[model samples]
Target chain A: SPTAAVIAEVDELREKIKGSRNSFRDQSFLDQLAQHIADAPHLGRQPIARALVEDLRGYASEPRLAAVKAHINEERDQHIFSLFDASYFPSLSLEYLTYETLPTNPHLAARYASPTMPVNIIASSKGFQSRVVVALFPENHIDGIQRGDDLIFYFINKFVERHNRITRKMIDAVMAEGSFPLLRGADDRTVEQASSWWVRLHEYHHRQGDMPIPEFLRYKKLKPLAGLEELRVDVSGMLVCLNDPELPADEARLAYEYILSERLLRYAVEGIPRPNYDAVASQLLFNYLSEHGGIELHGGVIRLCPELPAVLTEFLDRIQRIEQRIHTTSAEEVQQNLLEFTNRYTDYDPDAKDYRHIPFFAEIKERLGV
Target chain B: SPTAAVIAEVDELREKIKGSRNSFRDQSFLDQLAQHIADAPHLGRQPIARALVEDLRGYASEPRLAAVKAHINEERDQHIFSLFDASYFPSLSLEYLTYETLPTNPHLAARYASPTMPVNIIASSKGFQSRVVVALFPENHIDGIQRGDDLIFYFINKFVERHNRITRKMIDAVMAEGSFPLLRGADDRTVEQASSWWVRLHEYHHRQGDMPIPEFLRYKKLKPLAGLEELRVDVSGMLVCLNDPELPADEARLAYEYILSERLLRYAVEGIPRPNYDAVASQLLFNYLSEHGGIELHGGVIRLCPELPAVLTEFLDRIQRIEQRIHTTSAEEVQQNLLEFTNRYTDYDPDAKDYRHIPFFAEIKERLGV
Candidate 1:
């Protein structure tokens, strides 16, 4: 299938770039380069790559013409792939450790600090330099603590970790029992195998920092570009899945069943976007799948349709063009394109302050005492 | 259209049953019958009707055979419709008083009770004695009091009232502005007219307690039957609007758009049976619509297909049979029928303790401070 071709191409690109490495520099060079990025807010990716290459001239041997070109191309390609992943797995944090787990000893907490921790100089820079060892802590550290406004800052990380784990377990248990409540014929192993791949696909996107979309550089605090980036990666993931020839047919079926069921249920239960990054990305993909016959909810069953691959390819192509436009065109044009794209799925003003429809929120809060 | 036939039949029954009346009697007979029902927990509708008629033998001239038969039919029919409405609306209360507007007088709070208070003691034996005015207490009645388990009783009622009002306003505003985010070509006036009727249909069901379904008498606390009843009414409402020749074509279109969008969006956001009375019914309708080509979510737009009436008729017929079986069959047969009907949509164990997938529950709760 044509979908397989897209996946094959992605694989070939990964293979070609397999042996490439980012050379390490002296501590001073690393610090200086990091500080340079810190000082300039709107620096482009190409310029950043250029600066790194320039700084390397004295410390490392002069690059061959092919090597130099490949390095630049690799950096550019990395961004493009990263762009795809960001949208596909919007706001997907790999951090499982909660903040309360930060060592009671501030000294040890420095080493245990999350890599993605915000720009607190004490935590991000100084903590790492101090060489303090912060080890992983069990969830029970804050047990019996009253969940109040004061405690919620730490509670959020724990909630997210539990949320992810529960979601996986729920899907696994449901699939093992026989797909969703009504859907059947899927084998347990096939369902599990498919689920692993489904998550792995997102994990791959999360790790692709070598190449990054530079559009995000110009559009700081702008949501439209972020939404577009998410859409781009979501389609790319679908393309990879659809085109993979070695994926067992049963695995594909079960994988789709688990994914489609999850998506269908999520949207069925939660209405409208919350006007946030993940909201736009999630709603956009659902709208696309709904339009393209990628999935259907029928007779109380959510079924993955045969037309998914073809429609995904079509969507993938459309998103690719939108991504290219984002990178090559002026910011104004990019904004207009994104606006047009978003309008295809939603008619509400994305800038509206309150768009959420949370029917279960109150009951859950009361139960949690939060 | 075939759906019009079902609507015509329903109207005919309404007309035929209209002239028949349950004659008002002295306070003694009414009080005695009310007490009889209040005291008996396992009274079926037929037996209750028989008891009412038997007890009425000496109060006035005996009811004619046609009058007695019609009265019983009307009573049975009322419950069926009521059962339908309860599930479709599912805890839909209409009190609109915001918490900020409570009166200063603590004494006045005793008279302003919510119309839909849950439980009450009636004077089954006295001549309308022991009157209980279930007052809507001002939220500030407990102003300085802390909210714990005891206060949650009032808080829940308050929450439900606010939820319904906000939902209605959100829907009305969205429909009026043609701002459902992606649906198009709906005129403001048409949207409002349709929305009003769409809601009016459900309101019609809410007031249907003058008659009641007999089956619920035997199966007092079972929720599945209630869910099926709700599914019946929702489809019935759609069929009524779609088939009515008197309804303007534009009005019908707008009505379909408003109602379909509301249902579509709700199910799109939330999925599956939570063993709640509403989940299966909501999911069931969505599954029908998706399969029957009544609605499409494609390329970011939610489009209502023209084939809505036909598919609706098809589903309406299916539910009519389920409703018929419920009324005509043994309790065991009805259970089997409901199980078969429900399994057609979901396969998860309904008796499980919890099956909610509330990803946004915490964030929404924090924002709402519930």
Candidate 2:
């Protein structure tokens, strides 16, 4: 019952994200942000990125008092028991208070805590817990404003994985139980089909990183795609999964690799270098596998570890640093801090668990209030 | 100095809109609204019928302060001196109270006043100048949420025009007074080319709505257009002043007619029924002629009208009305409300000086607390 409920709750949230609602935030800003990520050199999944942003905007200004109540009521009819299902959670009501706003120096807490813990823990932790805090000097904060758009977009891009992970867990629960499709899918198959296809695609996407464009359908070679391109891809994936039920993992990999190749070529043509091809490829592989069997490319350490050529390895290493910067620090602090870290310690910390611990990191942490 | 100063001001404003250096109201909201308008349609830009529903979600939130400020600043600049001479004018701050939030009913004032001012002159009569009111509706305001994207985009789009116009005007003034490069003809003697090529190009644009696919290019004849078969004809039209030196009165009409024909064909293929193509085309011609020269389109009533064959006329009218109800109304309402007026009164009121003015205009004026 608990698992079923979580799955149901996730479905509802996903629908809310997919819903046709006007945003309170500048529609242009969200669109621009989507475009930035969509247009990011190595990244793919523009539709999902667009969907995620629009969905987040939906919950911008929920009732302060009724948020919890609404969450419970939302999950009730779908056979999702909100009473005991901790997993069937509400959207995070994030109040990103600065150290100045906090009673204790939140920046000090950030130094000790992990960034992952703060966000994921917010989902699991009881009572208000400040699991993650990063320090920033006023100058760095000001710098953040200077590069605000790219910085903000980068922050959300990093969270895309987290969003998928959360959605996947809920989807698993929903499919496991029979009550999931009882509502809309039972009557209008379109909703059911859309949800089923979406969930599977996302699941495969988790394994593949993004749904693969089947080799047969790559570049729309198999047929003329109609309607929105993303929706067409979703439909193609669904039909392929339906007809070729025994489709091999390799086929999925091939399909996804073809997709990755398509995306890479698109990026290349745009004159954007693929610095993070491996991770992006891996994510694409993740999504493909979770939804279908696997993509055209072989995945995991065994396949990927060997496939990564020396040049790719070097590329990946540089990208890891770039990703770390993009993920951990504000755009303004990322480069400066990285350069400072390299300068301060010629010695590499392979196990530099936290970015702030590096001297350059420490300086930036001090400068930016990590 | 004047030209360079305007450029500098534009650059500064662009930074303010796109950058984080400035203290903005609801920064994320401002960004979101702007991006949506650029990439796709926003509720405000849609018809009033569509906007009211689509924009409800955006309206639930408070106004985006930063966007509001940016909009107010931009509007103020354009409302007074236009973007060209913005640098010459002093910036002033003032309150912006919407019709709905005004203390008194504007429509009632218009309807029952001792003397009627211009149509929709409620605000002006109340001695209200254009500016941002701090919080007319503290709980909910559509300014930055739904309409924010439209507001900023419109100003940006307009500012581009102003910048171009001002620069061109200044260039012309200087050229008229001083020496410049003289064009030499085949005769080998230096002779003045009345206008620079760039100036001619700009003038050409004013006469034509868009750059022509000039006969020399032949690009239009080269390829298959998506969603349709081969082209029937390449329609041309002067979007700007037809009576100007660049294009004589006759040529302008030909251009306008060509464009009108192309548009009419597109509407037909798209299945829009008998549209008021004649009226829109004629009005545009009048506008173009009056601006450029006293000369106008010299034609009989039939010549000025859209030549949608009698067989197609009834069909076109039906199709366009459907399109209007579905799409156009939503977009216009966001800029300014006018859906019900169109819906309620299809027949003309000959006695009415302001012909476009009609019934729902009264309800909206009252709603604005005019």
Candidate 3:
């Protein structure tokens, strides 16, 4: 036997959680983890809770937190609890772990295979909104963000009150009305798991491609590749939801709708402060979809066409081909190759030294002001 | 990652094997493994060929042969090539390994989840068959068994050659012709993988339920439980092919057809030397299928109806419920519960101290004489 480790054990506690209402929501579990950090003495030498707590408070990017995460991943890789995904994501705000379903040929279709969707999000406005949510929505502009005005609840106020007239739509809206409704049209648990699948897939794609994000970072200007990576992964995750056999039909559709809303619409509307990678990626996707016949703006409404799924599949295939060609590229060729790929769909402003989007997106943000 | 090792590496060799003409048929690859046993030095402490060759030729019961197989399973369980079913099975005949797809909730739907199907089938008439296949079909059965007499080729010669005169069918044959054909209509690769999926699922079920086969062996007599366990796992595997989302429609349907043919037909027809567990289990399934409206015998022709899928699902659900009740029982209740369950459907002859079927089955065996 080689060295894959069991990531996590499905004990009584793990089995019991599946039945709880908090099965999907992990805030309570994360809080308990914090307790284990502070009180549980067996985890590590001395105590990490005190040492890492401060760094973890602002929500991640701590070497100490990363150390623990790296350890968990290593355990999985080393074959400890080998049969499960049990891969864990630790941040200041949440800790997410999941069982792996599709564990092979990752290079082929690993778009949203990470199941790290749960790594981020949830109480997002309170802790983190995202790569762009941080750049776009913040504490100062985020007034009453949690209870009233954030993107998630803004719909409850904006469209729940006027379901027919205001017409809120994302890239694919066949079931938009039912996908995420004011009421619990969707099971939070189901959507949470599905999104977790998507996020994990999104993370998988970041590690892929010719100039995968790891290598892309050497440019010191992480846009373009990083931004494109976000778009690429998000597209990959949606395709899983659209076509992957492992995803259940209802779960996939709900996940597909939620991700499109998150990627194309929410990211599209939020005001950009700088050249954030994810936002720019969202912008690129917006334009790409418009040209690709997936979405269009009519009067005041943006609609996801019935043709979106096929369009998305083609979009991902194109992304893979571009990545494949880049995979063949040597060091000297990246900068040129990356920008050409980025600028193919995204607009760049040399004066600002940043990427810009069509005013159509900005106008949508103005109309749906956070 | 812990100590789990890589069971295999998905290298160029592995990927290419997925496409080549021998993708499904492992006779060629097995010959290569034999060469590796003789020539490959990196494999072991010393040359295993000189020591284990004799045991391996007879396949596999020897401690030495079991050692390599044990190593393969350990690599998988330990997690070497983590994220894959890369768990290999090496009998005297064939080898099988697969990527881990559904790596969690294994005790639940593990029935037929194993990809070990390829382990023992090709050249079965020439080399091996089963516990019963060993006990059932062998070199002594023996003459002309390879080309004209075996179960598989028998169907080819019997049904393909006589389309209308003879009625040849299995448990559920909605697309019988479309599912499997003699003139190379069905893809060997597809069926092989699907059967592998089913076999993997079957193996998973063996380790589950209240009285999993591992523990059931404690009894002096293995019949009631082992036989029932076989029936249980076969049923469990069928349920998976019918409902598991990871299995594609075409693959699942094809797998369902092949397994049903193997379990409900071929096993049903073969003349039993004695109470072989798998064959007994097959007889139980045959009887159960008859009573449950899955199969009907009319005028010497057996037919699998459209309602079989739903019936099979319900049958599995019932099996699970019974197993749950058994789960609560202490050691005292097994003899009672198991015998009641098995005898509820199968007939016992005290004078001969063996299980006997109605003349219809024996007549079929006689009429379709091997």
Candidate 1 Cα outliers beyond 4 Å, as residue runs: A1-101, A104-370, B1-192, B203-228, B267-276, B299-301, B346-370
TM-score of the second chain, cand. 1: 0.43
Fraction of native contacts under 8 Å reproduced by each candidate:
0.00, 0.00, 0.00
Docking class of 1: incorrect
Candidate 2's displacement at residue B189, Å, is 30
Candidate 3 lDDT score at position A54: 30
lDDT of 1 by residue, A111-155 (tens): 222222111111211111111112211111111111111111122
Tens digit of per-residue lDDT, candidate 2, span B1-370: 4333433333344333332212233446444534433333322232221222233224336433333334333443222111110110112111112121112223323322221111111121111221211111111232313221222111112222322333223223322222111210111111001111112222222222211223112222211111011111112112332323444444334333333332222222110011122222222222332233422222210122222232133322332343344243543242122222222322222221012211212111122211
Give the TM-score comparing model 1 with the true structure, all chains together: 0.31
lDDT of 1 by residue, B1-370 (tens): 4323333333333333222212124346444543443343332233433444354443345322232223323333211110001111111111111111111112212222212222112111110111111122212111112111111111223222332444334344323344443225434433434444554454334233311233243342244445556555555556655666565565555555555555544332332112243444555565567667875644323455668678878876775565466456776676567657756654223322112222121111222222
Candidate 3: CAPRI quality band: incorrect
For each candidate in turn, the TM-score is 0.31, 0.21, 0.32
Give the distance in Å from residue B346's predicted Cα in candidate 2 to where it truly belongs: 30
Q: Considering TM-score, which of the candidate structures 1 and 3 is the better prediction for this target?
A: 3
lDDT of 3 by residue, B1-370 (tens): 1111111222322333322322222344434444444443332123223333333343333223333333333433211110111101011122112222222234333433332312322222111221212211111210112211221101121222222222233322322333344312444444445445555566567667766644554541345555566667777777776777765666666656666767766555443323344556677776777898987765445677778888778766766666666567754466556666666776554432345543445434433441
